Amino acid sequence: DEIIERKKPIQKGQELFKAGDELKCLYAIRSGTIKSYTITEQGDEQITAFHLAGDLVGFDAITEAQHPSFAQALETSMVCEIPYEILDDLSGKMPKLRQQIMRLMSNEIKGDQEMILLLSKKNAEERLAAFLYNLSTRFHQRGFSPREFRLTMTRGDIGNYLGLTVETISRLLGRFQKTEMLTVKGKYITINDHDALAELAGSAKE
């Protein structure tokens, strides 16, 4: 009867919600970048995922109508916030919509499962490769140059997420640059050899 695509101006640094917040809205990334993290008892930040354009945020909060995690813009971002009730209401009416919602949640499970394997079996070189490959192909997927993209998150955040040093991360980028596999200019990454990167990415060797 009346669809609305009201978009919202989320500046860098600010939270979509907090860990404990009641699930009012799910948030759809129309543009920009969100990170999801949690704070440990000891008080440290641990990032559990990164969200890009197209991605929906808060799936982990449905079960208990409560956000178990923080979200935060890593840059200026545009969001469409949906009251869950409305969503489920509309996806009950619309097949190819929920079929997509299922598909999107499905994909977040697949991802975390991959992230679990990564943290289990993969070495530092493999993790960064797997990370850059993933980023790269979600861009290419969404519609971007599969070879040039910008790292929106810090190198710190990448290390946090992959369980690696900022030192380590920058050394690795040097290696990838030295091999011509990759071109790095500040936050911009150019892939010159997707093959080689994919190899490195999907290894998991001792």
Question: Which residues 88-107 are close enough to bind ligand FES by CB under 6 A?
Answer: none
Q: What is the spatial distance between Cα 91 and Cα 98, in angstroms, rounded to a whole number? A: 5
Residue found by looking up tokens 């900022």 in the block: 166
Which of a copy of itself, ligand FES, none interacts with 68 (beta carbon under 5 to 8 A by kind)? a copy of itself
Residue range at the interface with a copy of itself (CB under 8 A); choices 8-16, 27-35, 101-109, 190-198: 101-109
- What number of CA atoms fall less than 13 Å from residue 107's CA on the CB side? 13
Residues 6 or more apart whose Cβ sits within 8 Å of residue 106: none
Query: What mask, x for binding ligand FES by CB under 6 A, covers residues 184 to 203?
Result: --------------------
**Is residue 28 a contact residue for ligand FES (CB under 6 A)?**
yes
- The residue from 11, 119, 141, 142 that contacts a copy of itself (CB under 8 A) is 119
- The residue from 7, 15, 24, 48 that contacts a copy of itself (CB under 8 A) is 48
Full strand arrangement of the beta sheet holding 25-31: 8-10, 77-83, 25-31, 56-57
- Residue with smaller CB distance to ligand FES, 54 or 111: 54
**Is residue 103 a contact residue for a copy of itself (CB under 8 A)?**
yes
* Cβ-defined contacts of 179-185 (< 8 Å, 24+): 182/132
